Design a protein around this nucleic acid. Structure first.
Ligand code: CTP
Ligand code: D4M
Ligand code: MG
Ligand code: ZN
Lengths: 49, 1362
DNA sequence: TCCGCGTCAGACTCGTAGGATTATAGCATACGTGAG
DNA sequence: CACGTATGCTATAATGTGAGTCTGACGCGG
């Protein structure tokens, strides 16, 4: 009866970059930060897989 | 050129003219069309020199034939263009201009000289007001300011016979008229008559200034500039960019400002302009010169084009970025390269993979050279083209040059000396540098993209210094601790662990082999496992009394695996070394053992062998990291629901009334901290063993071969702390403030945090990451302060022949001996023939290096205390003796004379801080502290020994302690100290002094949260000065109404209560004061900030009761963030807010005066008739009572001691040991091993200077501060010859000031505060003879240390003749 | 002793970008040096 | 003598200005 509202998605806390990390739930926040940071450094290959 | 010293002094107007080669009259730079220098402009060729080599401007004389031929037509000398970087010019200023550095730089020289405040001088300079220069009529005296209206009054009445002027002309006249001699005598006469304490300093300082001014031969007028020097053109260049545009220095904009306004001033003087306009122009001229010298000091700096302030002269010297730190104390370097690093597991310890193309380029001159000696290259340009074409024969020549040629590898940051190492290079195809694994530790190298600098030592000398001193193989031990830095890790560890570790039966349990060869063949054949018990016959080789090795053959139960590792193990070592399951910790000991028994080459070979076998078996095994590895305890949910309803019950009790925010914070943190340990220990029992393997018939228990458990137990990678977060519970995380979040993370990484647990994790994570970026800065700033202070310290002598040293006892704190005496005195020169108990035969000699063998003898006899020779007590002037220092911990033998000890000390103290900043922070998330410091339980039976303790017996029957410093010890039978235990104040002891307790008994219980105020006397309780709202606060309850009192401190307190000390006073039934047993003191206990008293006034107390609970919020987290500021505070000698009081002079004391409650402790010694009287706070309670014969430095108050007071009363070894222990407390809390001798070096540098009383035969008089070495030199010649004896007193300097107090001004300038250092040196006319290292590095010379010590000592003896 | 002032704050790496911003009067005599 | 560079004078009256703020710490001097 006290509850007024609820989170729309489980994703809303996280940004775009971090949303692309699969098992984020099992990853330390520091390592996850650098992961989201290195995805931005990824050079596209000849065959996009 | 080769010179002896450098001196700095004020520039005379005429001196400035000497350097100048002409007056630049015009702002003209160059001609827009012919981009050549304009007439008498800023780039004038007529003044600074020719633009092109041996060519005049108008072009009449060309070629090297024309030499010094000044062209008559244009007026340009035919010399090299180089001259335009060296020739200076000048500017004729219309008005005299004050030099900002002597005006604004604090304290200031012009102000201190005239004894005239800055404000007065400035009013004069900006032409607001006149100043009197001299009036024969005392009507107006000297230096008296007159406003515009004040000047009109005296001008009519007296006029003429009184001289008062405005602007820099006035101040220059005032400086010219001032007689340095006469004022010196007048000031000496003032000090003779009435020397007031604080103004004696200031008068003595102006006397020192006047004396120093006359001795320097500087003239005060010269502080005001009449001629202004101009920097040579090439040092403020106008060059064309590719785009056709030009680019120029900001000095050109500032010079043009000055010239325009100066020339306009000449004009307005020629034109006889009205005075208001002349004044404005003189203001603007001084503004422009002050902007040119030091922009930003004179207020708002002049912004150029972007808005950024123009970079002025001083700005190019001053900043870190100036010229000292950037271009002179370090530079960019030829024959330098870099690239990504990658592993070279195939390499030997002394080798590194160097890319082909990289090495081709670095050794270009060496190739050119061999190419011409083989006659393959006709000349250098053909050799260059052969290299450009990269011809096949060139590769073969390059291979020949690199052979036996060492290359330096460097990694940023270079924290300690092993951050540079030499290797023999191995040419490799590919662009990445290959690094040997075992040195990755010293570089802190991990291959996820780190890069390294390569440097080529060119000279034969540099090659030899690289191969002998800097080689990887030769730098095995660290400069800080004696432990080795080079050691196998990761795979090399995993492989050897897999080999040694044993399993149940397996293939071929209980088999008999004939040596390790049979074992290996069996394992390779596939009939035996590596972890299977098998009886083998190994033949170990043990060293005898001489150099001969004795051979011993015996049967010992072992695994196959360990037998095969024995094959790698050199003869001399015991088989017991390989017989355990090996981890990284055991392998490090293995290589150290081998080094000290067998020597360097065998350990080198053995190290390589360990690496090869380790990696080869690492791939043979096949360890993996599965998700099933991290097994969660079945009993987590129970522990957590229990812990969770518990914390819930305390939160509900919070609204009730037994709880402050601090108390509940402590209680919740304690509950979760114990829960975390519980779940972790559940996981580790369930994981570490919980291996049900059926032995040969029935079931057995043995260690688990779970992958993550093996990784943790071997010490290969993760610790138990990390695996807690994986498989157990993540725990309580700590905010960026350091205060810990009340809600812990119940989950682990295998379980998956949920959105809320992950979000809560973020705080700790990011504070960790921000910590690495930000704190490494203050860490690094401490490294640099330390280095500057201990640069000069070098081993100068072999033996000073001193007996003096500091008594080192074993660090036995917290039951388990923290640091053994043997290790603490391992590698030190023993002082004073210290034998065994029975004094009738010497056991140990005097000057003898404490080797591991001597140390092992010490342990059989169980010596507790040893006077050892230390750096601090060494007599050597201008350095320290090899014996006072002891072993070079990095070499493993006696230190070499000439070694730069100070640098190594500063680096080794600095490194751990800087490394522990980034390291613990990125790696951990949460804080795993454990606060449950309630009960002391004793581990081994013995009798209770209480030293320093004053306790009162309470009505319970129990001994309740009321001492501040209390040390419970555990004595055995023989009577040695083995366990220690710091009992606090407010403690209940189970048993009293000298009583027997059994193993596992609790001997004292105390509350950790709340330090109670415990009363000695019994009676009724009285509220003194405890006015509600003024000093305390009142808070009331329901139904009946329980009020509770909280003592508001002066922070929250009103102006009314400020002077009142609030205190619970003990009165009896009559309502008279109860006395404290045996003294005239009435009982009264002064309550500090927020002392929460429950029980309201008039309540009968018994003795030994808790009056008041002051809350003790310990929001501290266990990290270096909080430790390092304490380290910096000790090194810089930062006096605390409440210094500890100590006996000043020995003798017999009674009390005199009191200010309300403030004690005025009166010492009246026995022999020394003069008293010493101290004001003391009322609330600070004394350890001493009344008439006792206390000696110098007996502890009176409770509170932290100032290192100053320790040095000043007890002396050197006292204060040195205080610093060493207080610093080491912090570093030891973080698991950092630094030898005391390094800290001792820096304390020696702290105690460099000494103040002097009285005169000798030199110029001492009252209170000059001179260095200790130099006054000792004087005292040695004085004692032999006689003359006036001089009393001295050593002064402590904290690091920053100690580095600025060095008599080298080049070192002082390079360190910090450069503007101020150069003004004080320039005014003193100081002469730097270049003795220190920084000084010689700046002039680009040989260091007076290491290799350079030989050459440098040869120059010092060339000073005696020729 | 209270409060404006002024000197402090890790080490290397690379990748960079922008020239942007601004307005001035127009014409005759004088001052000075260079080309034919 | 031409070319480049500079100093000259203009006559309605007009005559008083004008960025970014916030670190935290410590050690002297007034
Ligand atoms: N801003 C930084 C980052 C890194 N380093 C140095 O480089 C080392 C390695 O950095 P990094 O590779 O990020 O850390 P590791 O502890 O090796 O962890 P990982 O590579 O697994 O992330 C740091 O410990 C530190 O000595 C530094 O001085 N300054
Ligand atoms: C980001 C960063 C990195 N490094 C070093 C430490 C490891 C390598 C690679 O860094 P990255 O992976 O951030 O450079 C630093 O030395 N300083 C830094 O600020
Ligand atoms: Mg790295
Ligand atoms: Zn010429």
């Amino acid at each position: 009866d006290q509850v007024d509202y609820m989170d729309v998605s489980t994703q809303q806390v996280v940004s775009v970059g971090a949303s692309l990390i699969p098992f984020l739930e099992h990853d330390d926040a520091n390592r996850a930060l650098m992961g989201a940071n290195m995805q931005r450094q990824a050079v596209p290959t000849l065959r996009a897989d | 050129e080769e010179f002896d010293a450098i001196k700095i002094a004020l520039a005379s107007p005429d001196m400035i003219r000497s350097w100048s080669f002409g007056e630049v009259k015009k702002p003209e730079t160059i001609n827009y069309r012919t981009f050549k220098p304009e007439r008498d402009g800023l780039f004038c060729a007529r003044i600074f020199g020719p633009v092109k080599d041996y060519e005049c401007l108008c072009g009449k004389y060309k070629r090297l034939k024309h030499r010094g031929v000044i062209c008559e037509k244009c007026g340009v000398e035919v010399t090299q263009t180089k001259v335009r970087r060296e020739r200076m010019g000048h500017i004729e200023l219309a008005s005299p201009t004050a030099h900002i550095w002597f005006l604004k730089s604090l304290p200031s020289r012009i102000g201190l000289l005239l004894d005239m405040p800055l404000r007065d001088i400035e009013r004069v300079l900006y032409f607001e007001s006149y100043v009197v220069i001299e009036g024969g009529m005392t009507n107006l005296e000297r230096q008296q300011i007159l406003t515009e209206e004040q000047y009109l009054d005296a001008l009519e009445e007296f006029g003429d016979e009184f001289d008062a002027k405005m602007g820099a002309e006035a101040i220059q006249a005032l400086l010219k008229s001032m007689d340095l001699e006469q004022e010196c005598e007048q000031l000496r006469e003032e000090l003779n008559e009435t020397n007031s304490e604080t103004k004696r300093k200031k008068l003595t300082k102006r006397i020192k200034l006047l004396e120093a001014f006359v001795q320097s031969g500087n003239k005060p007028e010269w502080m005001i500039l009449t001629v202004l020097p101009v920097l040579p053109p090439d040092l403020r260049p106008l060059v064309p960019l590719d785009g056709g545009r030009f680019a120029t220095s900001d000095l050109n904009d500032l010079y043009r400002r000055v010239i325009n306004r100066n020339n306009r001033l000449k004009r307005l003087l020629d034109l006889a302009a009205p005075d208001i306009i002349v004044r404005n122009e003189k203001r603007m001229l001084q503004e422009a010169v002050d902007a040119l010298l030091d922009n930003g000091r004179r207020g708002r700096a002049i912004t150029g084009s972007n808005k950024r302030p123009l970079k002025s002269l001083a700005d190019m010297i001053k900043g870190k970025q100036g010229r000292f730190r950037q271009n002179l104390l370090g530079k960019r370097v030829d024959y330098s390269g870099r690239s990504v690093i990658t592993v070279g597991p195939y390499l030997r310890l002394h080798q590194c993979g160097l890319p082909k193309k990289m090495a081709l380029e670095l050794f270009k001159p060496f190739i050119y050279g061999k190419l011409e000696l083989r006659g393959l290259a006709t000349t250098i340009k053909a050799a260059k083209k052969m290299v450009e074409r990269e011809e096949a024969v060139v590769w073969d020549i390059l291979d020949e040059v690199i052979r036996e040629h060492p290359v330096l590898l460097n990694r940023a940051p270079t924290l300690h000396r092993l951050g540079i190492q030499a290797f023999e290079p191995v040419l490799i195809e590919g662009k990445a540098i290959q690094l040997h694994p075992l040195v990755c530790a010293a570089y802190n190298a991990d291959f996820d993209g780190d890069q390294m600098a390569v440097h080529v030592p060119l000279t034969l000398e540099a090659q030899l210094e690289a191969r002998a001193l800097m080689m990887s193989t030769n730098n095995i031990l660290s400069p800080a601790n004696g432990e080795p830095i080079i050691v196998p890790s990761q795979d090399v560890v995993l492989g050897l662990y897999y080999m040694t570790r044993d399993c149940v039966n397996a293939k071929g349990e209980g088999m008999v082999l004939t040596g390790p060869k049979e074992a290996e063949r069996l394992y390779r054949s596939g009939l035996a496992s590596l972890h299977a018990r098998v009886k083998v016959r190994i033949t170990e080789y043990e060293k005898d009394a001489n150099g001969e090795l004795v051979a011993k053959t015996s049967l010992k139960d072992t695994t196959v695996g360990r037998a095969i590792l024995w094959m790698i193990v050199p003869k001399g070592l015991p088989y017991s070394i390989v017989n355990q399951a090996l981890g990284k910790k055991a392998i490090s000991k293995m290589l150290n053992t081998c080094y000290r028994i067998l020597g360097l080459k065998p350990t080198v070979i053995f190290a390589d062998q360990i690496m090869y076998t380790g990696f080869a078996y690492a791939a043979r095994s096949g360890a993996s990291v599965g998700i099933d590895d991290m097994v969660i305890p079945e009993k987590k949910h129970e522990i957590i629901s229990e812990a969770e309803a518990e914390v819930a019950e305390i939160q509900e009790q919070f609204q009730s009334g037994l709880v402050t925010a601090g108390e509940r914070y402590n209680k919740v943190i304690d509950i979760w901290a114990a829960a975390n340990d519980r779940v972790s220990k559940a996981m580790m029992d369930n994981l570490q063993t919980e291996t049900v393997i059926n032995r040969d018939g029935q079931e057995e228990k043995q260690v688990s071969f779970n992958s993550i458990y093996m990784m943790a137990d071997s010490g290969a990678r993760g610790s138990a702390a990390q695996i807690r977060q994986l498989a157990g519970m993540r725990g309580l995380m700590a905010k960026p403030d350091g205060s810990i979040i009340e809600t812990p993370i119940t989950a682990n990484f295998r379980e998956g945090l949920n959105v809320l647990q992950y979000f809560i994790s973020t705080h700790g994570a990011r504070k960790g990451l921000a910590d690495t970026a930000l704190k490494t800065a203050n860490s690094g700033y401490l490294t640099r302060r330390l280095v500057d202070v201990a640069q000069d310290l070098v081993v100068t002598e072999d033996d000073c022949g001193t007996h003096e040293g500091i008594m080192m006892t074993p660090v036995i704190e917290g039951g388990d001996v923290k640091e053994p005496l043997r290790d603490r005195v391992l590698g030190r020169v023993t002082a004073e023939d210290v034998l065994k108990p029975g004094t009738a035969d010497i056991l140990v000699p005097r000057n003898t290096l404490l080797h591991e063998q001597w140390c092992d003898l010490l342990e059989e006899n169980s010596v507790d205390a040893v006077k050892v020779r230390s750096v601090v007590s060494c007599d050597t002037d201008f350095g320290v003796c090899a014996h006072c220092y002891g072993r070079d911990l990095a070499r493993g033998h006696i230190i070499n004379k000439g070694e730069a000890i100070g640098v190594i000390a500063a680096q080794s103290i600095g490194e751990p801080g800087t490394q522990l900043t980034m390291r613990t922070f990125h790696i951990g998330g949460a804080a795993s502290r454990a606060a449950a410091e309630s009960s002391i339980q004793v581990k081994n039976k013995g009798s209770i020994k209480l030293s320093n303790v004053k306790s009162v017996v309470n009505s319970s029957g129990k001994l309740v302690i009321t001492s501040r410093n209390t040390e419970l010890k555990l004595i055995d039978e023989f009577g040695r100290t083995k366990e220690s235990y710091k009992v606090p104040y407010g403690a209940v002891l189970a048993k009293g002094d000298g009583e027997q307790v059994a193993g596992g008994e609790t001997v004292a219980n105390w509350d950790p949260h709340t330090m109670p105020v415990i009363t000695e006397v019994s009676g009724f309780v009285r509220f003194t000065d405890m006015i509600d709202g003024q000093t305390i606060t009142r808070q009331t309850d329901e139904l009946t109404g329980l009020s509770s009192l909280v003592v508001l401190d002066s922070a929250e307190r009103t102006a009314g209560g400020k002077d009142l000390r609030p205190a619970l006073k003990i009165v009896d039934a009559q309502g008279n004061d109860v006395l404290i047993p045996g003294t005239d003191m009435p009982a009264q206990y002064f309550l500090p900030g927020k002392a929460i008293v429950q029980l309201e006034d008039g309540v009968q107390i018994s003795s030994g009761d808790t009056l008041a609970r002051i809350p003790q919020e310990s929001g501290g987290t266990k990290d270096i963030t909080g430790g390092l500021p304490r380290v910096a505070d000790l090194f810089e000698a930062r006096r605390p807010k409440e210094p500890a009081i100590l006996a000043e002079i020995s003798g017999i004391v009674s009390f005199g005066k009191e200010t309300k409650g403030k004690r005025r402790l009166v010492i009246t010694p026995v022999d020394g008739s003069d008293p010493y009287e101290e004001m003391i706070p009322k609330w600070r309670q004394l350890n001493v009572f009344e008439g006792e014969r206390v000696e110098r430095g007996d502890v009176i108050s409770d509170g932290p001691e100032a290192p100053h007071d320790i040095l000043r009363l007890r002396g050197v070894h006292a204060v040195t040991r205080y610093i060493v222990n207080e610093v080491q407390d912090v570093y030891r809390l973080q698991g950092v091993k630094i030898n005391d001798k390094h800290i001792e070096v820096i304390v020696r540098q702290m105690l460099r200077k000494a103040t002097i009383v009285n005169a000798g035969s030199s110029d001492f008089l009252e209170g000059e501060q001179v260095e200790y070495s130099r006054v000792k030199i004087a005292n040695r010649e004085l004692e032999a010859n006689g003359k006036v004896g001089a009393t001295y007193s050593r002064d402590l300097l904290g690091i920053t000031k100690a580095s600025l107090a060095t008599e080298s001004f080049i070192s002082a300038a390079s360190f910090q505060e450069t503007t101020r250092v150069l003004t004080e040196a320039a005014v003193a006319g100081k002469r730097d003879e270049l003795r220190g290292l920084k000084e010689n590095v700046i002039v680009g010379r040989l260091i007076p240390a290491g290799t350079g010590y030989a050459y440098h000592q040869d120059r010092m003896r060339r000073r005696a003749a020729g």
